Amino acid sequence: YSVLYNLAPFFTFKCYGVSPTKLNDLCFTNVYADSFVIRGDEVRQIAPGQ
Amino acid sequence: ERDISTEIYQAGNKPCNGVAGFNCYFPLRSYSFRPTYGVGHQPYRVVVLS
């Protein structure tokens, strides 16, 4: 995550379950990545339950 | 022990006071409560006797 974390043009990086700044010590059995491009106004819509 | 000081989280490698942005976070977050929320997220009142 260090190279992703230190990628400068990131604007919004919002998590919902754990701390987002110490992922190196945290290990998971799965990683799911989904990608798309949307309007700015509905950018806040990515929160669940919108 | 209790903590009240409101200092912006400088969780980055830059001397950031700022207002918002990358590695420049306001530590406090607001609970939001409404009756539509399901069981397990409605507010609970807690009193501890020592």
Curated annotation (Swiss-Prot), chain B:
Record note on what altering residue 11 to V does: Increased resistance to neutralizing antibodies
Chain spans, region Receptor-binding motif: 1-44
Result for mutant: residue 26 to S: In strain: Lambda/C.37, Omicron/BQ.1.1, Omicron/XBB.1.5, Omicron/EG.5.1
Region (Disordered): 1-26
Disulfide links within the chain: 16-24
Domain of life: Viruses
Biological role stated in the UniProt entry: Attaches the virion to the cell membrane by interacting with host receptor, initiating the infection. The major receptor is host ACE2. When S2/S2' has been cleaved, binding to the receptor triggers direct fusion at the cell membrane. When S2/S2' has not been cleaved, binding to the receptor results in internalization of the virus by endocytosis using host TFRC and GRM2 and leading to fusion of the virion membrane with the host endosomal membrane. Alternatively, may use NRP1/NRP2 and integrin as entry receptors.
Subunit comment: Binds to host ACE2. RBD also interacts with the N-linked glycan on 'Asn-90' of ACE2. Cleavage of S generates a polybasic C-terminal sequence on S1 that binds to host Neuropilin-1 (NRP1) and Neuropilin-2 (NRP2) receptors. Interacts with host integrin alpha-5/beta-1 (ITGA5:ITGB1) and with ACE2 in complex with integrin alpha-5/beta-1 (ITGA5:ITGB1). May interact via cytoplasmic c-terminus with M protein. May interact (via N-terminus) with host bilirubin and biliverdin, thereby preventing antibody binding to the SARS-CoV-2 spike NTD via an allosteric mechanism.
Name the UniProt record assigns to this protein: Spike protein S1
Organism of derivation: Severe acute respiratory syndrome coronavirus 2
Gene: S
Part of the full-length chain shown: 465 to 514 of 1273
